[PDB]
C-alpha cells in the first residue's frame, strides 16, 4: 500500500518537511510582493 497508494496510510504532513518547498514559496511570494511594491515606489533589491 505504501508503494502503490500512500494517501490513506500516510497522514497529513507539514510543508517544511519537503526539501526547498518553503524556500520556493517564499521566493515566489517575495517576487509578487516586489512586483506590487515597485509600481508604487519603495525601491527594493530585485530578486532576479
Amino acid at each position: 500500500k505504501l508503494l502503490s497508494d500512500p494517501a490513506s496510510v500516510i497522514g497529513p504532513l507539514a510543508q517544511s518537511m519537503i526539501t526547498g518547498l518553503t524556500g520556493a514559496l517564499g521566493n515566489l511570494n517575495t517576487a509578487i510582493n516586489q512586483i506590487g511594491d515597485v509600481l508604487v515606489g519603495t525601491v527594493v533589491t530585485p530578486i532576479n
Binding site: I32, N33, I35, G36, D37, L39, V40
Partner: protein, 49 residues
C-alpha cells in the same frame, strides 16, 4: 498588498492617460483657434475685417 498597490498604480496611470489626452486635444484646438483668429485690418485701412 501587492495587488492593491498594482490597482493603485493602474488607476494613477489611467488618470495620467486621460489627463494627457485631454491636454493634447486642448492644446491642438487652442493652437488651431489662435491660427484661425488673430490680427484684423482696422477700419481706415479697409472696410472689411
Amino acid at each position: 498588498s501587492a495587488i492593491s498597490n498594482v490597482i493603485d498604480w493602474f488607476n494613477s496611470l489611467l488618470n495620467f492617460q486621460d489627463t494627457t489626452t485631454s491636454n493634447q486635444i486642448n492644446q491642438q484646438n487652442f493652437q488651431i483657434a489662435t491660427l484661425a483668429s488673430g490680427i484684423k485690418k482696422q477700419q481706415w485701412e479697409c472696410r472689411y475685417s
